[PDB]
Structure 1
Amino acid sequence: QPAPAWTTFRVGLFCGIFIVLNITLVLAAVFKLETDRSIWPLIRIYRGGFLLIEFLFLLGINTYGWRQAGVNHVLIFELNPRSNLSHQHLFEIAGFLGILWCLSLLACFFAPISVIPTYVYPLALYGFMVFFLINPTKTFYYKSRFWLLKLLFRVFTAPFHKVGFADFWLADQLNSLSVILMDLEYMICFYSLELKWDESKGLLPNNSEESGICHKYTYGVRAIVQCIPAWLRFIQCLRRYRDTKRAFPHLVNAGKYSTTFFMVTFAALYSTHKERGHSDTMVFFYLWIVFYIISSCYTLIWDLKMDWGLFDKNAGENTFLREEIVYPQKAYYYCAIIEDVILRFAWTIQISITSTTLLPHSGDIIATVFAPLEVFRRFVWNFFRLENEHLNN
């Protein structure tokens, strides 16, 4: 059933406002903003919002593809059939939130008029977003927000509730998008300790020794925020093994999700060795590389053989694929296989660099450039994971 023209009109309106706002924001950044003042904290704060907008748009594309390809994903997700969301609603939500984000960024740049210079706009934007998430009224897709909040509650207390499809799907989705979590942690420490709240102007060049508290790992305020999604998925699979008493898949998933834990603690140990300047620190590098390989070379085999269900013995004419495929063109499969091996190494490198406090001058730029790539990798992963899930049933 086609959606009413009002929904499409709203989607187009929001898309056009988003496009024009992006163009004028780029122009203002190129011309108005001056290079002398450091602008890295602004990008660090707004990266999470941009990632959320991109994820919402990509999920709209994903549900479009699932609807067109013939995948019965409403039964797989166990959603209520009589109230389901098409791509247009997700597009509208993403456009509205993106317009709000662009308005906040433009206000932060220009700062039209206020007494408090610039440090109320990110707080305002994130507060508006969280209020939209947990608004107690019965409007603005109340059923969807209620379902998502219940799913979040089930996921974040995973070792107690029975594991379902949506639980692990959202666990993986959070595993890809943890950059929002680290950005939130950075924002929290920066507002709590660094910024001069009872002052004016705002951000200033930092020359004191106490500066850059969020940059350092302190004791543990950095690594655990990195590996929280890994812990969630690890405990989810442990509970699933307990409930099902099946050895192979869950027992290998435990090691798969503990490899990243090992890599993260080893990178933190390398950082504290650099702080200590030990003679064996360079040797400490080599082992990291080893646990780099056993990390990536782990998940790759899980990405193609078990996740997407490729490399089947009964491939037949479909070279390097499975016997049955619902997508029309194999070029998509081959491009996805080619791009996944490229993007996995970049994702692991970004995770290591963000928490290891390495590359002081180029680490932030590397993270900024490579952040909107793991989201696309997950977007590619979703299609084939759900296709294999539908064909398995």
Structure 2
Amino acid sequence: APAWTTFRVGLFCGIFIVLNITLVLAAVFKLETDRSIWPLIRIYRGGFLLIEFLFLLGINTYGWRQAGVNHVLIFELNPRSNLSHQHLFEIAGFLGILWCLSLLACFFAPISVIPTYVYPLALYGFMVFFLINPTKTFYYKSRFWLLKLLFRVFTAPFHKVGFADFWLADQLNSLSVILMDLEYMICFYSLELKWDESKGLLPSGICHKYTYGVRAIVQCIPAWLRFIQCLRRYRDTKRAFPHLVNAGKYSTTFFMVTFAALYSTHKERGHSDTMVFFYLWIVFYIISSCYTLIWDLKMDWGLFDKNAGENTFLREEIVYPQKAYYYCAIIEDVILRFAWTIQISITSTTLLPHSGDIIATVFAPLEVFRRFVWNFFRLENEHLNNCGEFRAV
């Protein structure tokens, strides 16, 4: 990379660091105890998760390049022009500066005239604009490639699946919280925000409950897309394995989230059917967790193979130098696959609100971390032994 690119990476990282420190200190001093800070947390959580995802993605690209995994051939990107990790670090740092500035302005009151609710709106409006700018400025080829890919994923039955389509839909399975925060923000300004008050951003009413049957559809949105892609892939190929077995993996989420919305609704009423539904919500919690975990370990990463030989419990060939990495990865995935399922059901109105909001906010970055670790061995098991059969050489 050129020297100005590394200069810009470091510049944005340093501004981000100091902005974070002053954010924490203003939080522990300037803020006032009486008002509620939760809408404010629920609104900014999505941008935080997006920035973290881009940073971790930049570390993924560095790891793939150094270890020798040909990720340009698998994604079928152009050999000549490709983003390297420094460009991703730069985008992450810039969007992080805007996030820190908007949140800081929401804590302070730098301008009297401007109402506080404007700042959250001004941040997310800018991000959409940067992505959809018509002019050939600011990584225009990257934004255009991403936009064409996004169009194909959201219209799933109609296109032939390629590695990139399959890959982005999975990433969207772990980023579901951003969609929920967006539906929550869209709902909140429309119904529970009083526009007339000068500082109405920090005011419960009905804006954080799975009651109007919308929040369930919103977390089943990515699982539905992957289930549909698996069915289309089965149509073309005509092989029941592994396309019909994989679709079921994605269908388990429907039953589990269906039951959340059911026990919570029955409980809130004076109904005695609540116990029965509670028996079922639990059963479709262990089934889903075990099914996703076994699929991860044996089919996604390709471990526990018969001819492992020396690398015991692993596969025959390994690309990353240390076996410790693989063993820590196995244990980490095992303990975080159990954490993911609980936060999914919980979002759909289960545990009384006071204790629930701190579990989701703590466990969302850990789900992004689990996807970050999943990327390494998935791409490695693709490069070695053609696992998805997307190229079929």
CA distance in 2, matches of 1:246, 1:274: 44
Secondary structure in 1 aligned to 2:353?
coil
Counting aligned pairs with the same residue, the percent is 100
* CA offset digits 1:298-335 (Å, max 9, x no partner): 01110100000000000111111000011100101000
Shift of the alpha carbon at 1:358? 2.6
Query: Which residue in the other structure is 1:287 paired with?
Result: 280
- Check the 8 A contact 1:216/1:357 in 2, yes or no: no
Shift of the alpha carbon at 1:14? 0.3
- Check the 8 A contact 1:267/1:352 in 2, yes or no: yes
* CA offset digits 1:123-173 (Å, max 9, x no partner): 000000000010101011000000000000000001100011000100000
Secondary structure in 2 aligned to 1:200?
coil
CA distance in 2, matches of 1:254, 1:338: 26
Shift of the alpha carbon at 1:218? 2.9
CA distance in 1, matches of 2:197, 2:20: 31
CA distance in 1, matches of 2:200, 2:240: 56
CA distance in 2, matches of 1:25, 1:164: 43
Gaps of 5+ in 1: 206-210
RMSD value, Cα: 1.0
Shift of the alpha carbon at 1:217? 2.2
CA distance in 2, matches of 1:364, 1:249: 37
Change (3 A) 1:204 1:23: closer
Secondary structure in 2 aligned to 1:202?
coil
CA distance in 2, matches of 1:171, 1:204: 35
Gaps of 5+ in 2: 387-393
- Check the 8 A contact 2:43/2:182 in 1, yes or no: yes
- Check the 8 A contact 2:115/2:198 in 1, yes or no: yes
- Check the 8 A contact 1:309/1:388 in 2, yes or no: yes
* Greater alpha carbon shift after TM alignment, 99-108 vs 30-39: 30-39
* Greater alpha carbon shift after TM alignment, 124-133 vs 192-201: 192-201
Which of 337, 341, 347 aligns to 2:334? It is 341
CA distance in 1, matches of 2:163, 2:252: 23
Which of 139, 149, 167 aligns to 1:151? It is 149
- Check the 8 A contact 1:215/1:357 in 2, yes or no: no
Change (3 A) 1:362 1:261: same
* CA offset digits 1:192-234 (Å, max 9, x no partner): 01101133221465xxxxx432212233111000100000000
- Check the 8 A contact 1:57/1:94 in 2, yes or no: yes
Query: How many residues matched?
Result: 386
* CA offset digits 1:4-40 (Å, max 9, x no partner): 1100000000000000000010010011112221101
* CA offset digits 1:346-385 (Å, max 9, x no partner): 1111111112343321101111111110000000000000
CA distance in 1, matches of 2:219, 2:384: 34
Which of 236, 242, 245 aligns to 1:243? It is 236
Shift of the alpha carbon at 1:248? 1.3
TM-score normalised by structure 1 residue count = 0.96
* Greater alpha carbon shift after TM alignment, 213-222 vs 246-255: 213-222
- Check the 8 A contact 1:234/1:254 in 2, yes or no: yes
* CA offset digits 1:47-70 (Å, max 9, x no partner): 000000000000000000000000
* CA offset digits 1:253-304 (Å, max 9, x no partner): 1110010111000111111111223213123212111110100010111010
- Check the 8 A contact 1:353/1:359 in 2, yes or no: no
CA distance in 2, matches of 1:102, 1:199: 24
Secondary structure in 1 aligned to 2:296?
helix
Change (3 A) 1:203 1:72: closer
Q: Does 1:297 align with 2:290?
A: yes
CA distance in 2, matches of 1:85, 1:200: 44
- Check the 8 A contact 2:230/2:247 in 1, yes or no: yes
Which of 192, 196, 199 aligns to 1:198? It is 196
Q: Does 1:65 align with 2:69?
A: no
- Check the 8 A contact 2:188/2:207 in 1, yes or no: yes
- Check the 8 A contact 2:267/2:274 in 1, yes or no: yes
Shift of the alpha carbon at 1:114? 3.0
CA distance in 2, matches of 1:392, 1:104: 47
- Check the 8 A contact 1:241/1:247 in 2, yes or no: yes
- Check the 8 A contact 2:174/2:368 in 1, yes or no: yes
- Check the 8 A contact 2:340/2:367 in 1, yes or no: yes
CA distance in 2, matches of 1:308, 1:267: 31
- Check the 8 A contact 2:116/2:198 in 1, yes or no: no
CA distance in 2, matches of 1:339, 1:286: 28
- Check the 8 A contact 1:226/1:355 in 2, yes or no: no
* CA offset digits 1:170-201 (Å, max 9, x no partner): 00001100100000000000000110113322
* CA offset digits 1:91-133 (Å, max 9, x no partner): 0000000001000000000021132331000100000000001
- Check the 8 A contact 1:227/1:261 in 2, yes or no: yes
- Check the 8 A contact 1:111/1:117 in 2, yes or no: no
